[PDB]
Amino acid sequence: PGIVELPTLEDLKVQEVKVSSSVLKAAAHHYGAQCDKPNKEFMLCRWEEKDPRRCLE
Amino acid sequence: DGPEKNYEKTMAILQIEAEKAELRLKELEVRRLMRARGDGPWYQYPTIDKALIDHSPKTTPDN
Structure with missing residues (x-):
């Protein structure tokens, strides 16, 4: 009953961080407060827009 | 007493019975109607x- 609209793989070819888990955890505290503004914007979108496809940008 | 008493009194009897008779016929119809549609106060x-x-x-x- 419709189309499950999915984004093309083009916009999914975004640079991904290549670091082991401990690297994230070690600098997690020094990462959260210093990159909060985009992090909050994305996760606000996740809870507000409620749809994964909306917060791709 | 006079026949007027019995005449008028029986007219009231007929008036009461007629309204009661038609109300019951309405009641069965409404009960059927609002049970099916459901957009009524009772049967909710x-x-x-x-x-x-x-x-x-x-x-x-x-x-």
């Missing part, structure tokens, strides 16, 4: 109140 079978809904943000965005 219980549902779940919307108040018991947690609108607080969950731990997962997809909600």
